[PDB]
Design a protein around this ligand. Structure first.
Ligand SMILES: [Cl-]
Ligand SMILES: [Cl-]
Ligand SMILES: [Mg+2]
Ligand SMILES: [Mg+2]
Ligand SMILES: [Mg+2]
Ligand SMILES: [Mg+2]
Ligand SMILES: [Mg+2]
Ligand SMILES: [Mg+2]
Ligand SMILES: [Mg+2]
Ligand SMILES: [Mg+2]
Ligand SMILES: [Mg+2]
Ligand code: NA
Ligand code: NA
Ligand code: NA
Ligand code: NA
Ligand code: NA
Ligand code: NA
Lengths: 156, 140, 95, 154, 186
RNA sequence: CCUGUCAAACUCCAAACUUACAGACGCCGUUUGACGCGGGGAUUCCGGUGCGCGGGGUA
RNA sequence: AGUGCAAGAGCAAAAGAUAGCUUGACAGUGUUCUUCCCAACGAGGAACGCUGACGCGAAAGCGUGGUCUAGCGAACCAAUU
RNA sequence: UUAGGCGGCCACAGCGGUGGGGUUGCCUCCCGUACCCAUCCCGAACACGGAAGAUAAGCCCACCAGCGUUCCGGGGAGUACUGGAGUGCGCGAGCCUCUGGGAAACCCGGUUCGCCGCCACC
RNA sequence: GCGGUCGCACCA
């Protein structure tokens, strides 16, 4: 199914698992990538900033992250960098799959609500922005237009 | 300062935690005053489902009744250390517990303006061993 | 509303903030008012008795006599005149 | 003391806003009233802020408008210096104007209609879809700004 | 103490001095309270009314200012209590106070107790108070007879020096007698 | 200890705002009698749209 | 924690626990709110009184069933006091 | 208030800690069980009777901010949100301007280790 | 309500 059906934040926040059952598991594999043994002790720090509030299905999160990290292997399976996706798909999403009679849908998935300007991804790298490329590929698989922002790095 | 800081025995509780008694009799003679029933709480597998139910007795002795008892109890015990309270108490044995404290304890046991005893004025394990050990026997 | 009992939707108004929790001070449960006095109605979550229908929480009526120890306060619900039987525990002097 | 002029019609305007203008004696478009600067009055004008033009006029301007558009509580009578002198505490329009501006009295107190029924602005106003700071004609004005409007509607 | 949500008891409940549940019931009568309080050595009796910023004591009597009338005996006993009640009761009457309810604070309603003796006194002073006669002591014990007889089992004076060796429930009468007419502060 | 996130059926907090009563100004009423009381006569109980706030629904 | 049972709320020298005693889960009659916001409408419900008779308590006092919001039923007819 | 009793507000008063104080006004701890009364067992408590001793508890007095709380300055922030208005922008979601209001977290620095009432009293 | 889960009876 299309993002068209769930990308807007027009519905109430629906996240109380105590009243919702049958919620599908998340497809997101990991949130911490790279050298998670080490702490952000890197010279450069780039972030992927979403430019519009939207909902991002765990589907797009996984594809976005995979496409970015799977690429960050321009640095090697045990390369020196750490990648972080800070958002989690808390918002439960339904589908009315009778016509409009008793239409409250049944749980079909989850999504993460991101507000325009938040950073969804943050990578930590030594002067070697291959990560800038890992993100051109990441914001390729999420609904919004995005800003690739660099923070600690006056090494231009 | 002292005199009102020096330990003293406040009650010695001798209780037989049976599981259902005829045992009171011996407690009465071993101590010198009537024993009290021991009802239990919660229903459990040891065929002890009855809430209100005699399952042992105890006897709280105070003053001479407590000494005159310890003057035979203690001798029947050896242990010491580790087996002492953080408040200067100790239980050995049929159980025989000895509650120890200093002079102004009533402040925490009365009805009016009661108050909890300050940690400083509390009795330490050590200050306890001393008092008792200094009364017909040895520590550890 | 999914039901129509008196306490429907009263979760907030009949609950105390955690710190105001517990038996309330007796001073205000014994306050005495005079006929003609303006009093603000506000149920005290801690005091079970002497209450009035939650809908009137916030009203400001006029004491006009009493019934037993409870007071009879006159208020105006929308445009309708009503008389409320309430104890001091739930009243406060206006101004 | 501020000069109030309704620049937007009643159709579709909130009722509680319309009632406010009405309490300020304005019941038609282009009608103007003089209002003391008090807390109570200030709140009213703020509520009516989007359908009116207001500001503190200059002694001269007030005088021109008073002369040109002031009326007796009843009747056609022109309110000129003589009228003013033979009917009010002051001796001429200027004296009345000053008193109004210094909020010492009111049009009613002096037997005058609380409303100055102005004429449409000669040359047209700046628009009723934007405030002054945006080039429109709504909201608070400059003494110079109010004067221009009042004068064009003299 | 632990956090923002923590509930700290009213001060007088922390101090374990006021029972607020009983207080409310007491105040229900709308009458003045006859506050009966004791100390290891003394006995106090106050007639308290309700006030905007706290209680107002309109009349009181302490077992100590009993001597001021000729008391030459200990002040932490039954005869003492009664008299302090009667003394406060009289001052009470003088103040225009006619009735009151017995507030025994955190004490226990034990029959023949000193608080009830205090109550007996106040009643005899003229104060109208809700009571129950057979919860009070039998006059003789109020007089202090139980103590005189206790000194009969002498061998050693019950009173260290003090006054008398065999004590005096008679001293009691002389005093009650005194309080029942004229004299200052009454 | 450090570090990454949430809540229509969470809340240590907390608006704008809505609301009871009172005073003040405004406006209104005392011949145009208001506020209110009693009585006669209805029509009406298929609604719609814009905007703000919504709940459901891919729409 | 507990407080019979949904959910939300109340409660600690207690509204919870233990013990003891008691039968107010009483008769009669009302005021008021609710049912039905505003704003008319029955049964039902509740709050608060009074009259009478009682229980407990030293007493103030508490007890108009269960801490609060569900657990209810017209006329005709029958049986019953 | 050289120590008390009854309170009001009910943490600005809580939690924790330091120092000081009593031949007596005093409060306590304390000493003691013939009585009133009392422990489903214990004069522990409750109740009664009393002063040999003590200021070590409590309590009263002076103080400490580490935790919790109250209020204030500066920063966050006139940000977030928002009542009124717009032929302002945007495919749209949504945003912006004018007008009237206006936060929370958190950081840094102060405040807070109760205030007040009646009575009694070297 | 009456009769052995069933059958009969029954205008609140
Ligand atoms: Cl009501
Ligand atoms: Cl006392
Ligand atoms: Mg709500
Ligand atoms: Mg005219
Ligand atoms: Mg033209
Ligand atoms: Mg134009
Ligand atoms: Mg609302
Ligand atoms: Mg009840
Ligand atoms: Mg029948
Ligand atoms: Mg000391
Ligand atoms: Mg029928
Ligand atoms: Na169907
Ligand atoms: Na995109
Ligand atoms: Na409370
Ligand atoms: Na009814
Ligand atoms: Na038993
Ligand atoms: Na001391």
């Amino acid at each position: 199914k299309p993002g068209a059906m769930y990308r807007n934040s027009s519905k109430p926040a629906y996240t109380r698992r105590e009243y919702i059952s049958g919620i599908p598991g998340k497809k997101i594999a990991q949130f911490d990538m790279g050298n998670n043994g080490a702490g952000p002790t890197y010279p450069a720090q780039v972030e992927l900033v979403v430019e519009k509030p939207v909902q991002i299905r765990h589907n797009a999160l996984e594809a976005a992250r995979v496409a970015a990290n799977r690429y960050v292997q321009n640095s090697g399976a045990a390369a020196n960098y750490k990648f972080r996706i800070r958002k989690f798909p808390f918002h439960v999403i339904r589908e009315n799959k009778d016509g409009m009679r008793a239409p409250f849908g049944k749980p079909v998935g989850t999504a993460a609500r991101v507000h325009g300007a938040n950073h969804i991804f943050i990578a930590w790298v030594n002067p070697d922005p291959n990560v800038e490329e890992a993100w051109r590929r990441a914001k390729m698989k999420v609904t919004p237009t995005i800003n690739i922002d660099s923070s600690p790095a006056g090494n231009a | 300062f002292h005199e009102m800081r020096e330990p003293r025995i406040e009650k010695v509780v001798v209780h037989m935690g049976i599981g259902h008694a005829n045992a009171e009799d011996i407690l009465g003679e071993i101590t010198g005053q009537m024993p009290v029933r021991t009802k239990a709480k919660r229903t459990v597998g040891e065929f002890d489902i009855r809430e209100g139910d005699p399952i042992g007795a105890k006897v709280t002795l105070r003053d001479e009744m407590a000494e005159e008892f310890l003057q035979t109890a203690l001798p029947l015990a050896e242990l010491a250390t580790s087996q002492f309270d953080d408040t200067g108490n100790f239980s050995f044995g049929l159980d025989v517990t000895v509650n120890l404290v200093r002079p102004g304890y009533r402040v925490a046991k009365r009805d009016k303006a009661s108050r909890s005893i300050p940690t400083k004025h509390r009795l330490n394990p050590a200050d306890a061993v001393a008092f008792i050990e200094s009364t017909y026997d040895v520590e550890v | 509303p999914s039901s129509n009992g008196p306490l429907e939707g009263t979760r907030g108004k009949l609950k105390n903030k955690p710190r105001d929790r517990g038996t309330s001070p007796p001073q205000r449960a014994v306050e005495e008012f005079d006929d003609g006095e303006k009093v603000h109605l506000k149920i005290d979550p801690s005091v079970p008795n002497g209450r009035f229908h939650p809908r009137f929480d916030g009203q400001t009526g006029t004491v006009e006599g009493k019934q037993g120890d409870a007071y009879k306060v006159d208020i105006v619900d929308g445009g309708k005149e009503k008389t409320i039987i309430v104890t001091a525990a739930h009243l406060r002097r206006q101004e | 003391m501020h000069a109030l002029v309704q620049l937007r019609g009643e159709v579709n305007m909130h009722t509680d806003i319309q009632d406010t203008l009405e309490m300020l004696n304005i019941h038609h478009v282009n009608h103007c009233t003089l209002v003391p600067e008090t807390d109570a009055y200030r709140g009213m004008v703020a509520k009516v802020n989007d359908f009116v033009a207001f500001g503190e006029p200059s002694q001269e301007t007030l005088e021109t408008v008073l002369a040109t558009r002031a009326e007796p509580l009843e009747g056609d009578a022109d309110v000129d210096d003589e009228w003013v002198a033979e009917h009010t505490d002051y001796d001429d329009i200027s004296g009345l104007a000053f008193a109004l501006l210094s909020e010492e009295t009111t049009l009613r107190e002096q037997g005058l209609s609380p409303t100055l029924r102005l004429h449409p602005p000669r040359g047209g106003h700046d628009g009723v879809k934007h405030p002054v700071k945006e080039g429109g004609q709504l909201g608070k004005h400059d003494t110079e700004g109010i004067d221009d409007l009042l004068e064009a509607m003299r | 103490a632990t956090g923002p949500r923590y509930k700290v008891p009213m001060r007088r409940r922390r101090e374990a001095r006021t029972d607020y549940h009983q207080r409310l019931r007491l105040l229900k009568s709308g009458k003045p309270r006859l506050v009966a309080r004791k100390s290891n050595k003394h006995v106090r009796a106050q007639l308290v009314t309700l006030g905007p910023n706290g209680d107002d004591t309109l009349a009181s009597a302490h077992s100590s200012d009993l001597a001021e009338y000729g008391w030459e005996a200990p002040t932490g006993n039954m005869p003492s209590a009664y008299l302090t009640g009667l003394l406060a009761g009289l001052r009470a009457q003088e103040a225009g106070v006619e009735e009151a309810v017995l507030d025994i604070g955190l004490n226990s309603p034990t029959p023949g107790s000193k608080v009830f003796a205090i109550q007996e006194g106040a009643i005899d002073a003229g104060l109208d108070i809700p009571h129950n006669d057979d919860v009070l002591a039998d006059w003789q014990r109020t007089r202090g007879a139980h103590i005189a007889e206790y000194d009969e089992q002498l061998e050693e004076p019950l009173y260290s020096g003090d006054f008398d060796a065999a004590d005096l429930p008679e001293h009691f009468d002389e005093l009650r007698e005194t309080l029942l007419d004229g004299d200052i502060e009454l």
